[PDB]
Amino acid sequence: HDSSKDSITVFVSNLPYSMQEPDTKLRPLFEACGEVVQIRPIFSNRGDFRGYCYVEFKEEKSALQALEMDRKSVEGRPMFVSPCVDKSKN
């Protein structure tokens, strides 16, 4: 595992499939909170999309505000956002 990317990675789930390109649809949301280096959408699916994607930020600070985006209502459906690494001590 890459610890270097752990502090700048946030996996998202529970997203609608109606969106053709998750890389550009999420951009206005994630970019608006912090710069994104690149998005790696799931394309290995042999049938239907998995509805999940990963986003990497050039700075750790972006990850921090990204947490606040969790539970945000999008298209009438809440978006599940969770940090790569859990924080045992606050």
**CATH number of the domain to which 52 belongs:** 3.30.70.330
Q: What are phi and psi of 89, to 5 degrees?
A: -110, 130
Give a yes or no: residue 19 inside a domain.
Answer: yes
Task: Please list the residues that pair with 45 across neighbouring strands.
Answer: none
Task: Please list the residues that pair with 67 across neighbouring strands.
Answer: none
**Measured distance CA(23)–CA(39) in Å, rounded:** 6
Give a yes or no: residue 27 inside a domain.
Answer: yes
**Measured distance CA(55)–CA(78) in Å, rounded:** 18
Give a yes or no: residue 50 inside a domain.
Answer: yes
Total domains, the chain: 1
Give a yes or no: residue 89 inside a domain.
Answer: no
Quickly count: other Cβ atoms within 10 Å of residue 84's Cβ.
Answer: 17
Give a yes or no: residue 90 inside a domain.
Answer: no
Give a yes or no: residue 55 inside a domain.
Answer: yes
Method: NMR
Quickly count: other Cβ atoms within 10 Å of residue 78's Cβ.
Answer: 12
Q: Could you tell me the residue range of the domain that residue 36 belongs to?
A: 3-83
Question: Which letter, b or e, does each residue of 55-68 get, where b requires 16 or more Cβ atoms within 10 Å of its Cβ?
Answer: bbbeeeebbeebee
DSSP state of 87: -
List Cβ neighbours of 69 (8 Å cut-off, separation of 6 or more): 29, 30, 33, 79, 81
Contact (CB, 8 A) for 14 and 54: no
Are β-strands 53-57 and 36-41 bridged in parallel, bridged antiparallel, or unpaired? Answer: antiparallel
Give a yes or no: residue 39 inside a domain.
Answer: yes
3-state secondary structure of 37: strand
